Design a protein around this ligand. Structure first.
Ligand SMILES: Nc1ncnc2c1ncn2[C@@H]1O[C@H](COP(=O)(O)OP(=O)(O)O)[C@@H](O)[C@H]1O
Ligand SMILES: Nc1ncnc2c1ncn2[C@@H]1O[C@H](COP(=O)(O)OP(=O)(O)O)[C@@H](O)[C@H]1O
Ligand SMILES: Nc1ncnc2c1ncn2[C@@H]1O[C@H](COP(=O)(O)OP(=O)(O)O)[C@@H](O)[C@H]1O
Lengths: 265, 265, 265
């Protein structure tokens, strides 16, 4: 990949950044492990009463829309407002956007507070951009449609980078459009791959990387962990285990990023 | 096993059914993974505000009694009523029935809404049938006692199949009594085997299988995954990993179901 | 280790003790598995409405301060009061103590009810003892400072054993001061090692062991599982898997405890 992104220097993380995750109860054990496996320090606290003291210590924040409830709604909106008040680097992951009105309402509010990164899968982001969601949507036509939609969003949210994940990943900012083409289809066959990509982005933001760099490196690294894992694995449980294991190993190969496939458009 | 159940055709699932799990926070990561490993699509949302929109999309529902709380109680009773109003295929898993009055009260209400399948372990189901719970209860006498008790229940709940899990599994409907004898004792030595069997039943119901077929195939497949896993495993963590891994592999053997042991009584 | 602690007899557990965990949602799947892997029987129920009936059945209780919320606060304080009223053996794990006032307030209340064991990492326990938390704090000076601080606490809480975990582990009671030196640094690189040590202590208390014995054996066994796991492992996911696996295997070596390193001071 012909790119401005300086991959050689991303890993290992050296500041042990504290990454606070206001996240769902389904994938949180694995999100905490992911973050530790790349030398970040996870904290999963979400009680608003702690925010003043916590936010002083954290380097970045994950606001994950998954498994909504009245309690998670209070935390998410409280953390989003507060993150805006104190300029906390923030990744918003629109898990389930489009599933219901209530999710959409909460999701829209998070994005309105102008986070560092907004993230989702193709379906969620298309829905966020008010496009139809019919895959047919991974076509070159549909990708170009979403790129344009996301570029219109970055005009309203000019300090926010948008990430849509899929067979190809689409990253859009006010400055760049990047399409990435790593990973394997088995990365859809265990729970939390999207959630963990969110946490990895936050981790890189917290270490000090620029937003598009954080997004491109997090997605690339995780997807290349999948690629390696597929070669070593038989069965999906085993494939999952190896992907998570690679988070701590792929790093050690001086030239892991040579496998990155993607265009800056 | 001399049986009417057409195992050859159960796997692989081809409709990618969306299975909604209103379940406990202990085993939910593994329930989501289980469902993905057999090509179902898990959704763990439980906020009643979403139900109208979600229920339009889901193919089957898991209502798991585990880790009760006031929030889980509202979700469970709301989902149970609504599932009845719209005839959603539903598996009720009476995790912990007998532990407390409050669990029993919630549990009874779920069963009163007449789900497709009611499930628990021997102890829970015996208690549900108002039998003593003293194992002594896995004896041929005690099994025959429970069969009769469950047959009396299917008279009140004639559209519901009952599953009691154990060394031997007991399945009772208004039409059939089946005893299954697969699995290994190590399937009691990691958390969630019962919970995942519930989710697998829902998955098969959602794909389109008849209830007793769904129950018999889910239990058999999971227990045969255990049998295979034991031959490859040393240590319980390792045994767990391999059981979960087999969910995605055993399927691929054209004749996995030849290992099924059980009588139609 | 020259010690009064009779390790030969700790494992295997033979009473299948029921250990109730009022714990965080991050590491609970693994805490339940841990307990099963050493032949305890986990129950993760935390609704106060069940306590009267549950407490009749449980052998020991884990009160984990992690992932605080208004719901977890009610459960924790309710369970702590009740455990005191009925003399339930209780392990209090001060996860996150020092992070916020609200955590501290809840934590102090748990310790004020005089549990069997209070546990945390060096940082948390130092903060509990009102010491500064700057590692510099693992020095021989800082260890001696904490020992003295903990001895002053056991004067207020003379029926409570205190455990501070780290490179070296510090155990203090009114009768003994013990420093342990097993484990490997990778035990900080997956989530829940501290949480699981808490559950293991409870498990040994529930089986019938004296408090300091329970604490010393739980910490030693878990840390020696890590030591073995490191020799078999490549990558952190893999190291985690093997540590958890060893919980069920190391036991089987007649002389596992010969590897224990530590002084009674
Ligand atoms: N079919 C695929 N081929 C290659 N990479 C994939 C595929 N599906 C998902 N991924 C990758 O795995 C990660 C998870 O993305 P995705 O599954 O789209 O998230 P979600 O869990 O929110 O639906 C992303 O980094 C994505 O690039
Ligand atoms: N001792 C055993 N031998 C064979 N199969 C077992 C044994 N214990 C449990 N199983 C199987 O494992 C699955 C889990 O059942 P069980 O452990 O009874 O559920 P629960 O977790 O609700 O107590 C069931 O399909 C059951 O048939
Ligand atoms: N660097 C280390 N070297 C040896 N053992 C360790 C190390 N770090 C942690 N442990 C051990 O692993 C277990 C987890 O302790 P710790 O990581 O301090 O808990 P927490 O998760 O609460 O911070 C303890 O039994 C401790 O002795």
């Amino acid at each position: 990949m012909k790119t401005s992104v300086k991959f050689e220097t991303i890993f290992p993380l050296t500041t042990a950044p504290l990454i606070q995750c206001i996240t769902n109860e389904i994938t949180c054990e694995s999100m905490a492990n992911a973050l530790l496996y790349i030398d970040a320090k996870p904290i999963m606290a979400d009680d608003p009463r702690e925010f003043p003291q916590m936010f002083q210590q954290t380097s970045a924040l994950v606001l994950n829309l998954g498994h909504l409830s009245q309690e998670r709604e209070q935390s998410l909106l409280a953390a989003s407002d507060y993150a805006r008040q104190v300029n906390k680097l923030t990744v918003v992951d629109l898990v389930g956007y489009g599933a219901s009105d209530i999710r959409n309402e909460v999701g829209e509010k998070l994005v309105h507070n102008q986070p560092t990164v907004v993230k989702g899968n193709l379906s969620e982001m298309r829905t966020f951009c008010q496009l139809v969601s019919h895959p047919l949507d991974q076509s070159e036509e549909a990708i170009e449609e979403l790129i344009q939609a996301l570029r219109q969003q970055t005009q309203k949210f000019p300090q926010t980078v948008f990430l849509a994940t899929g067979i190809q990943d689409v990253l859009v900012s006010q400055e760049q459009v990047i399409v990435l083409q790593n990973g394997v289809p088995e990365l859809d066959c265990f729970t939390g791959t999207g959630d963990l990509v969110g946490a990895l982005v936050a981790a890189l933001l917290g270490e000090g990387n620029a937003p598009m760099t954080a997004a491109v490196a997090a997605v690339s690294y995780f997807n290349l962990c999948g690629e390696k894992a597929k070669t070593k694995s038989q069965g999906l449980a085993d494939f999952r285990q190896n992907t998570l294991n690679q988070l701590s190993l792929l790093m050690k190969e001086k030239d892991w990023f040579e496998a990155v496939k993607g265009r800056v458009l």
